[PDB]
Amino acid sequence: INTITFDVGNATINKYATFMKSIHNQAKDPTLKCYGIPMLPNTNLTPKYLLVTLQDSSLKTITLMLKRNNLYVMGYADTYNGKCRYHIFKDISNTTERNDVMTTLCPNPSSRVGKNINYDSSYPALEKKVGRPRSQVQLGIQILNSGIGKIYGVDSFTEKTEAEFLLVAIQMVSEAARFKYIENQVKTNFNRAFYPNAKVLNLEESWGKISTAIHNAKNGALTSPLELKNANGSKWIVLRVDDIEPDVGLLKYVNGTCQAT
């Protein structure tokens, strides 16, 4: 719990941009890249996880634990009464993962309470909970800041207040780090709440396929054009890595050799 902190309460663009470069610099494999784009490491490369602390305007704090190999959030922690309260997702199930998650988040026994999250850590599960597709749930720097207050130190919040905060934090953190395009959308709408546009949604949903495509590209040309959606909703066919390259920040891990540059 020696972590990367983002002060959402007094965020500035230059602040958020440094917060993303920190995650990008700890999450990326030290050597693997494809066409200049860094790639995430295999699961055996320790640190296996990353801790990101989000702090609000009242110095309240919430730390998220992410698997480094893929950037998916495993659970989070806050402070309840005078103890570390870890909340893990229902889908985190290897028995060696939820304990690593519990003891990394709150490393002192009998000074921690568990408040398991009874649902899966995946878009459908969370959309279900808030009851509304993520396209209708706004994102924003003041939105994330408030979310923190609905959670920290309160014993009953609602699975809807919590899933909602998570949907926001996952995109403004994991999706933004994986895609330069999403980060730029946040930065572009920093001083306002906004809805993810057709392309932020398609990219989040297309991360694995985009990563395989770019890993497999021969001499810079995709082995198979890719049909993606663009901002305003229309088809968008990328035939080359340089067509998509400016939008991607971190490639999923695909084992094998690719054109380093």
Swiss-Prot record:
Keywords: Antiviral defense, Cell wall, Disulfide bond, Hydrolase, Plant defense, Protein synthesis inhibitor, Secreted, Signal, Toxin. It is an enzyme of class 3 (hydrolase). It is found in: Secreted, Cell wall. The active site is at E175. The keyword DNA-binding does not apply. One of its GO terms (biological process) is negative regulation of translation. InterPro entries: Ribosome-inact_prot_sf (IPR036041), Ribosome_inactivat_1/2 (IPR017989), Ribosome_inactivat_prot (IPR001574), Ribosome_inactivat_prot_CS (IPR017988), Ribosome_inactivat_prot_sub1 (IPR016138), Ribosome_inactivat_prot_sub2 (IPR016139). Its EC number is 3.2.2.22. The keyword Transport does not apply. It comes from the Eukaryota. One of its GO terms (cellular component) is extracellular region. PROSITE patterns: SHIGA_RICIN (PS00275). It catalyses: Endohydrolysis of the N-glycosidic bond at one specific adenosine on the 28S rRNA. Disulfide bonds join C34-C258, C84-C106. GO terms for molecular function: rRNA N-glycosylase activity; toxin activity. Belongs to the ribosome-inactivating protein family. Type 1 RIP subfamily. Inhibits viral infection of plants, and protein synthesis in vitro. Has also been shown to inhibit the replication of mammalian viruses. The protein may provide a means of cellular suicide upon invasion by a virus. Monomer. This is Antiviral protein alpha. It comes from Phytolacca americana. The lineage of its organism: Eukaryota, Viridiplantae, Streptophyta, Embryophyta, Tracheophyta.
